[PDB]
């Protein structure tokens, strides 16, 4: 299962029937049909004690992993009940600046999309959380090409050391607060993981405000490999799933 022409997202349903489910992600966000919901609370992001451990090329993307054995970096408030711990973040990007994001806004695609994955502490661990309808909370942040994002450069510089699938590198003292936009206004809806096993266990929180990265920064994403060392080289690009039907779901907005 990958993003190629013979094993891309359009084939996934064969191994994972839930791919054609009722709350699949990503989706197109229609800003004019999103419902303003005054009952929604502001997001509470507490990343000040975050402990990054490692960066890994898993063949789908690269993951920056965090210590989630304590409430060090947590997400609360918003549409969430309870405390969600940060476990990892990763990106989806395109082969061109005009595509790469998974979610779209009024059909507009962005250059890339950042996913910060958190799990609901009441379920004890990530593996158990994914089996629950309220197990995960994923914070989605759009990337557009323009000015460089200083807080992203540490990630970019290390990519050379994890070029191929299975490669990992120590990655300590990275502060994820450097990746957040100024405003935390958001849309929220119930959805799924966007890669297999595509479990419908995610509360999506998609920030309205994109961050800017430079052409050179996103360019270095595109030099990674889907393949492992010694195998024929396949550039890691367009690792994004297409928008899925909204079906019986309403997208809510924390702003007007």
List the binding residues for substrate.
194-195
Taking the least distance from each CB to Zn ion, the nearer of 115 and 165 is: 115
Tell me if 115 contacts Zn ion by CB under 5 A: yes
Of the two residues 122 and 144, which places its CB atom closer to Zn ion in the complex? Answer: 144
Smallest distance, Å, CB 140 to Zn ion? 8
Half-sphere exposure of 4 (CA within 13 A, CB side): 10
DSSP H/E element including 191 = strand 186-191
**Which residue's CB is nearer to Zn ion, number 26 or number 78?**
26
The least CB distance from residue 92 to Zn ion, in Å, is 6
Region near Zn ion per CB under 5 A, out of 26-34, 50-58, 108-116, 178-186? 108-116
Choose one: 1-9, 18-26, 113-121, 209-217; the region binding Zn ion (CB under 5 A): 113-121
127 Cβ partners below 8 Å, 6+ apart?
none
Q: Does 60 bind Zn ion (CB under 5 A)?
A: no
Selecting among 11, 60, 103, 118, the annotated active-site residue is: 60
| Contact region with Zn ion (CB under 5 A), list: 109-117, 125-133, 183-191, 210-218 | 109-117
Token output for 82 = 């309870």
Question: Residue 224 in contact with residue 57, Cβ under 8 Å?
Answer: yes
- What value, to the nearest 5°, has the Cα angle with vertex 55 and ends 161 and 80? 155
Query: Whose Cβ is closer to Zn ion: residue 23's or residue 115's?
Result: 115
| CA dist., res. 13 & res. 139, Å (int) | 25
**The length of the chain, given as a count of residues:** 256
Q: Is the dihedral of CA 228, 234, 236, 238 positive or negative?
A: negative
13 is catalytic: no
- List contacts with Zn ion (CB under 5 A): 115
Residues designated as active site: 60
């Amino acid at each position: 299962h990958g993003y190629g022409k013979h094993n891309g997202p359009e084939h996934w349903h064969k191994d994972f029937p839930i791919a054609k489910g009722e709350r699949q992600s990503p989706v197109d966000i229609d800003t004019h049909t999103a419902k303003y919901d005054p009952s929604l609370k502001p997001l509470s992001v507490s990343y000040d004690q975050a402990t990054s451990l490692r960066i890994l090329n898993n063949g789908h993307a690269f993951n920056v992993e965090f210590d989630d054995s304590q409430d060090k970096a947590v997400l609360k408030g918003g549409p969430l009940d309870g405390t969600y711990r940060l476990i990892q973040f990763h990106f989806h990007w395109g082969s061109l600046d005009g595509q790469g994001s998974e979610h779209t806004v009024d059909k507009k695609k962005y250059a890339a999309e950042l996913h910060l994955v958190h799990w609901n502490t009441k379920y004890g661990d990530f593996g158990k959380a994914v089996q629950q309808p309220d197990g995960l909370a994923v914070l989605g942040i759009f990337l557009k090409v323009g000015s460089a994002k200083p807080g992203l450069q540490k990630v970019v510089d290390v990519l050379d050391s994890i070029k191929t699938k299975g490669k990992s590198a120590d990655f300590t003292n990275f502060d994820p607060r450097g990746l957040l936009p100024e405003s935390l206004d958001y849309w929220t809806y119930p959805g799924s993981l966007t890669t297999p096993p595509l479990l419908e266990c995610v509360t999506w929180i998609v920030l309205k405000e994109p961050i800017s990265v430079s052409s050179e920064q996103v360019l270095k994403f595109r030099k990674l490999n889907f393949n492992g060392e010694g195998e024929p080289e396949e550039l890691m690009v367009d690792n994004w799933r297409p928008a899925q039907p909204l079906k019986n779901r309403q997208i809510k907005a924390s702003f007007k």
